[PDB]
Copies of this chain bind each other. A is one copy, B any other.
């Protein structure tokens, strides 16, 4: 009797191929089902009964399919106030159904508000100190009202919860800032502002299970240091533990480093060792499925 792994991801990656031949306890095979958040739905009962429906409208000329995923791998962003959608209810549904996940459904749900995730980093920063964990000095605004000025310029204003660059606005002066402030009022949601950092390069330190990799963007794989490891290790402990994550940091011309954010299981695979990362995620998942 085979185990069913549901992978929530865009079609770009053929997960069935990297999971092929992988067996649980060296006996049980794994059937890989792959879909995007938008193509899934479900019903969950407190008695354990459930059903995850896949597609409806997609290739195959319309078809309704029922799966009973034994495990889930979430490689896609669960929420976005623009071009993505609100899948927070699906995450809730998966948790209600008691389906094991990577990353945990708990972390996925809690990752729905970027500044909520950032708030965790503020606590680590408070504890560790700048010499150990140099978090960028960002400002959170629950509501636009008091967005008067920015202590300096330019300032990057990040609006609501957006990904891959969306919702960001570089503001070079007091007047332009005030314009964006009004736009923030029209969004009916919070936003953050942070000083603009004139950087020499970007660094992303990733952690998949127990495997670490550091890449330098300006992508070149650079050596890991205890400093880098501390950043990602501490970050990987948030929301009960992140199995797949990465810390994005900038290296200022000023010499100082600045931690910008931490990304979860939907973190894009980068560099030229993408097949290594993919294979590591497979071993991680398989191992969790066995011990589940």
Q: Which residues of A line the B interface, CB within 8 A?
A: 21-23, 25-26, 41-48, 53, 88-90, 92-93, 95-96, 98, 109-110, 113, 115-116, 118-119, 121-123, 125-132, 135-143, 145-146, 189-190, 209-210, 225-227, 229-230, 233, 283-284, 286-287, 290-292
Contact = CB atoms under 8 A, between A and B. Distances in A.
A283 B113 CA distance: 33
B126 A98 contact: yes
Given A127-B233, A145-B41, A138 B92 contact: no
B110 A95 contact: no
Contacts of A47: 137
A90 B230 CA distance: 30
B53 A146 contact: yes
Which of A23, A131, A135, A210 has the most chain B CB atoms closer than 10 A to its own CB? A131
B226 A130 contact: yes
B92 A48 contact: no
A180 to B, nearest CB: 16
B190 A89 contact: yes
A190 B26 CA distance: 40
B26 A129 contact: no
A90 B139 CA distance: 13
Given A42-B146, A230-B128, A230-B132, A140 B26 contact: no
A39 to B, nearest CB: 12
19 contacts: A22-B26, A26-B26, A41-B142, A43-B141, A46-B121, A46-B135, A89-B190, A92-B116, A93-B140, A93-B190, A95-B116, A95-B119, A96-B122, A127-B233, A128-B229, A130-B226, A209-B291, A287-B287, A287-B290
